[PDB]
Ligand binder design. Structure first.
Ligand SMILES: Nc1ncnc2c1ncn2[C@H]1C[C@H](O)[C@@H](COP(=O)(O)OP(=O)(O)OP(=O)(O)O)O1
Ligand SMILES: [Mg+2]
Ligand code: NA
Ligand code: NA
Length: 314
DNA sequence: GCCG
DNA sequence: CAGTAC
DNA sequence: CGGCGGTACTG
């Protein structure tokens, strides 16, 4: 973890991202990672241009930060960028909505509150704006997962509940809590969302819903808001997925991430004429589902050594 | 932005 | 669907 | 030249 050039590239990357240039931002992201994972601090355009994820343009940027101490592009970042970042940090608003609000003359969250048309999701995002930008201590994510597990296992004690995401990857803090739920009998997972969510509502634990198709008996996810009881508590984002046991390993792998790790893994599967998703590991263009009873089986079928969750924190 |  | 989200 | 993971809600 030994480069200073990435600090400058990070600003450009974020600038491109909030302005909607998502593929250019991805290229910066991959390069920033390539720079982060190099041994010696790069000192040559040739040395830089050799690195995978770094091309002529990125090398030149590097060759300027080394031989000048600065990146000229950083002085010509659009003035809109910090406001675009402010707006897209509202949950449920992305770059398109942020750019529309900016075009309409809005410059602050007060402008948004008083003058913007907000979706139901965005109104919830705005009212929890600071809280959703916080990370919680690992210990708090444990309490939240346990709250969900207790409510679930009260209804069916055979239900398996696992906190995934950054929590399973062992991080000291968590942006939210990601809970996977399944049942080993392969059937009793069906239709339980209404039951589980109603239970968590009865005791006031859930405070708002963001994404929750409860009219669908095949509902796959709940994205919402919770808050533990007592003083000193903030509102926290809570994501729940309910999956068939036959998809456990792929769902676990997906939900544990990281996101970058998932993208890398799926890209690798595609090179081998396979396809990897939260549902299954399959073959080429419908395709054949491969047997993956455990995460280790997914690595194996892809010709990879098993990585522990903590080693997937890419 | 990068890569094939 | 486009947007936003995981 | 043109894709870059693959998928699930919302309105
Ligand atoms: N774009 C994505 N593509 C594929 N998988 C994703 C994507 N985004 C999120 N996931 C998967 C992997 C993530 O680890 C998991 C949970 O998402 P998320 O809660 O945003 O991240 P996280 O739990 O890893 O970190 P954080 O602490 O910020 O919440 O869902
Ligand atoms: Mg998370
Ligand atoms: Na947002
Ligand atoms: Na709903």
């Amino acid at each position: 973890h030994n480069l200073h050039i990435t600090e400058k590239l990070e600003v450009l990357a974020k600038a491109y991202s909030v302005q909607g240039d998502k593929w250019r931002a991805l290229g910066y992201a991959k390069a920033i990672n390539a720079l982060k994972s190099f041994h010696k601090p790069v000192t040559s355009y040739q040395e830089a241009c050799s690195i995978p994820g770094i091309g002529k343009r990125m090398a030149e940027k590097i060759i300027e930060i080394l031989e000048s101490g600065h990146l000229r592009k950083l002085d010509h970042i659009s003035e809109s960028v910090p406001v675009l970042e402010l707006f897209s940090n509202i949950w449920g608003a992305g770059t398109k909505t942020a750019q529309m609000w900016y075009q309409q003359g809005f410059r602050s969250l007060e402008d948004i509150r008083s003058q913007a048309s907000l979706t139901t999701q965005q109104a919830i995002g705005l009212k929890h704006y600071s809280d959703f930008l916080e990370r919680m201590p690992r210990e708090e994510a444990t309490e939240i997962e346990q709250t969900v597990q207790k409510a679930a296992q009260a209804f069916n004690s055979g239900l398996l509940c696992v906190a995934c995401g950054s929590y399973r990857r062992g991080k000291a803090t968590c942006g939210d809590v990601d809970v996977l739920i399944t049942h080993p009998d392969g059937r009793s997972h069906r239709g339980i969302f209404s039951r589980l969510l109603d239970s968590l509502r009865q005791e006031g634990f859930l405070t708002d819903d963001l994404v929750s198709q409860e009219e669908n008996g095949q509902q796959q996810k709940y994205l919402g808001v919770c808050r533990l009881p007592g003083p000193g508590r903030r509102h926290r984002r809570l994501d729940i997925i309910v999956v068939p046991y036959s998809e456990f390993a792929c769902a676990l792998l997906y939900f544990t991430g990281s996101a970058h790790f998932n993208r890398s893994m799926r890209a690798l599967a595609k090179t081998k004429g396979m396809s990897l998703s939260e549902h299954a590991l399959s073959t080429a263009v419908p395709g054949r589902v491969l047997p993956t009873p455990t995460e280790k089986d997914v690595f194996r079928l892809l010709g990879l050594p098993y990585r522990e969750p903590a080693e997937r924190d890419w």
